[PDB]
Amino acid sequence: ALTKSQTDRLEVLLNPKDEISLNSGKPFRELESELLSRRKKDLQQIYAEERENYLGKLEREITRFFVDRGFLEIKSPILIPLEYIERMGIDNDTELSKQIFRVDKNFCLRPMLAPNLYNYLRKLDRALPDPIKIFEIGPCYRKESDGKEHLEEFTMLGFQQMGSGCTRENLESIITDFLNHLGIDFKIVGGDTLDVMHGDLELSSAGVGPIPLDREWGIDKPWIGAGFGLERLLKVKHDFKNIKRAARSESYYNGISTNL
Amino acid sequence: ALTKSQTDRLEVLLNPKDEISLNSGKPFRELESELLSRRKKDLQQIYAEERENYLGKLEREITRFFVDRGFLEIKSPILIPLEYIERMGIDNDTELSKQIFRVDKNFCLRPMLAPNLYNYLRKLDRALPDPIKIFEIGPCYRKESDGKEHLEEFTMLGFQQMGSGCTRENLESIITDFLNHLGIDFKIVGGDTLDVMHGDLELSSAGVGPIPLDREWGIDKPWIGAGFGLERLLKVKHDFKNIKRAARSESYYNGISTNL
Ligand SMILES: Nc1ncnc2c1ncn2[C@@H]1O[C@H](COP(=O)(O)OP(=O)(O)NP(=O)(O)O)[C@@H](O)[C@H]1O
Ligand SMILES: Nc1ncnc2c1ncn2[C@@H]1O[C@H](COP(=O)(O)OP(=O)(O)NP(=O)(O)O)[C@@H](O)[C@H]1O
Ligand SMILES: N[C@@H](Cc1cccc(Br)c1)C(=O)O
Ligand SMILES: N[C@@H](Cc1cccc(Br)c1)C(=O)O
Ligand SMILES: [Mg+2]
Ligand SMILES: [Mg+2]
Ligand SMILES: [Mg+2]
Ligand SMILES: [Mg+2]
């Protein structure tokens, strides 16, 4: 009979599409040697043929999707002023105040893209024709309790449109086209606030402005937008049981264990 | 006569290929209105035609270059254990100890890619055929004195090959092909340590292993590698006078000022 620790070891080596049962009568050492062999071949194949990282390649696919649809690709600072968090309405009554990675006296790792997107919307409105369509992909940081759905270091897609055409229908059409393009099943459940759900997993929270917070950021126009976690998308796409398989990590490469 | 502050304002609005002299007899207000008009059209053009961010697009070009040459694309944690810094030999006698952005009791923002690359080399050597070729592009953080060549938040390309073919000649051929592909003039000046210089600007430091540090990381094979700052590459390519034009930023979009 396999010990719980032995079973832990084998599941780190197991692939979702693997069709091997750790409940058969085969000893640990051979089940382990079997899976080690498969995982080395998986990496050998990636090394020989494609060589692209899941998270990098997804960011590039999401980028071409939004560029082709008219959204300006933004790359803004990850290390942001702590004041941006207060100006987002994040008091201490909210959960997210406890979750901030502080850096100096006045800085933090950004837990969200909304402050920088807001700032880009305000500035670009003096130069670009209506509507203004932007998006960003990059790291975000939140302190979290251990979760199969939460990382402390993750990657956020955020997009936002300001001005004409900022309706909920249009926002749902963007979400729908986007996840149908990626091959990710979802349901949309719900100014407006809506969530994009995969079963009980939140893929995205989206929103329809104007909202009173906009005033603090110099925004006085309608808008629509959404944020998606890239690792959650990978988790669903590749059927990973734990989101750590999809993270920036030294433990996993494209969901294959690197401890062989 | 233009004040120094007025001239500061105009140079923020000026483009390297702009052919306007702030030393002519035209008043501030019209020189400013002239340049505002140009910069809005530059952004309008980007918005209408291509919409890709300089830093994102360069990362994608560098990625295809190294993937096509057989290097495995790595994305490893940006937030790393503080112990990785000591194990890199970064004592307090080195400059770099003072430059670390500490995060909790035990973490920091990575100032370099070498620890994670080292860890990937060790683990992948149990699975991949010789030679092992990896690379990574992503954020790095260092506290710096105000410089026209230094950002506190920048982007590093790092690549490393381990095993056979790890000669200085091969390392220079990779560097040479890479910068000729990008259209960036350079000179290489110099186990071995070499620098890739553009005038007095350091594009890259490279190295040839084995070196005694390798032992601490579980590496006992020869290697070659180099690190390049992406913003420095953009600075040279686009002839920016100050590296802030190329940074993750809310002040500049593809080197065009966003304060119009
Ligand atoms: N810790 C995290 N790890 C991975 N993805 C995350 C994390 N926090 C947020 N996301 C993703 O970012 C999206 C937008 O952020 P947000 O709406 O603020 O998340 P949230 O409300 O905190 N979701 P949740 O914590 O699961 O209830 C989420 O829907 C997730 O896709
Ligand atoms: N603060 C920074 N801002 C931008 N690029 C940087 C920064 N620090 C390092 N780089 C880039 O990363 C490369 C590899 O890092 P490293 O060799 O450690 O730099 P370095 O020796 O500190 N160079 P320098 O500080 O200019 O004398 C450098 O050659 C630069 O291209
Ligand atoms: N609140 C998260 C997700 C996000 C991003 C952009 C627009 C919208 Br609406 C929601 C964040 O600020 O990144
Ligand atoms: N020292 C910097 C640059 C670098 C990266 C990889 C290999 C080599 Br050699 C140099 C860093 O560690 O990122
Ligand atoms: Mg949360
Ligand atoms: Mg939410
Ligand atoms: Mg330095
Ligand atoms: Mg150097």
Residue numbers in the entry:
A (entry chain A), B (entry chain A): 189 to 378, 385 to 454
Quote the study that presented this structure, word for word.
Clear and well-defined electron density maps were also obtained from complexes between LFAs (2, 4, and 6) and DFRSc, exhibiting similar binding modes. We observed in the structures of LFA (2, 4, or 6)-bound DFRSc complexes that the carboxyl groups of LFAs form hydrogen bonds with residues L310 and A302 of DFRSc. As for DFRS2, we observed a significant increase in fluorescence in the presence of LFAs 2, 4, and 6, revealing amber stop codon suppression rates of 62.3%, 50.0% and 58.2%, respectively. Results indicated DFRS2 to display prominent aminoacylation activity with LFAs 2, 4, and 6, exhibiting K M of 0.09 ± 0.012, 0.05 ± 0.004, and 0.12 ± 0.010 mM, respectively. Our results revealed the K M of DFRSc to LFA 4 (5.38 ± 1.28 mM) to be lower than those to LFAs 2 (7.12 ± 1.67 mM) and 6 (9.80 ± 1.65 mM), whereas the k cat of DFRSc with LFAs 2, 4, and 6 (10.43 ± 0.37, 11.18 ± 0.29, and 10.21 ± 0.35 s-1 × 10−2, respectively) were similar. The relative aminoacylation efficiencies of DFRS2 with the ncAAs were then calculated based on the k cat/K M of PylRS with BocK, indicating the catalytic efficiency of DFRS2 with LFAs to be 1.2 to 2.3 folds higher, and contrastingly, those with DFAs to be 20 to 59 folds lower than PylRS with BocK.
We here report a novel, polyspecific Methanosarcina mazei PylRS mutant, DFRS2, capable of incorporating DFAs into proteins via ribosomal synthesis in vivo. Seeing that the poorly soluble PylRS N-terminal domain is not essential for amino acid activation, we employed a truncated form of DFRS2, DFRSc (residues 185-454), in our ATP-PPi exchange assays. We continued to determine the crystal structures of the DFRSc in complex with adenylyl-imidodiphosphate (AMP-PNP) and each of the six ncAAs 1-6 at 1.8–2.5 Å resolution. That is, D- and L-3-trifluoromethylphenylalanine (1 and 2); D- and L-3-chlorophenylalanine (3 and 4); and D- and L-3-bromophenylalanine (5 and 6).
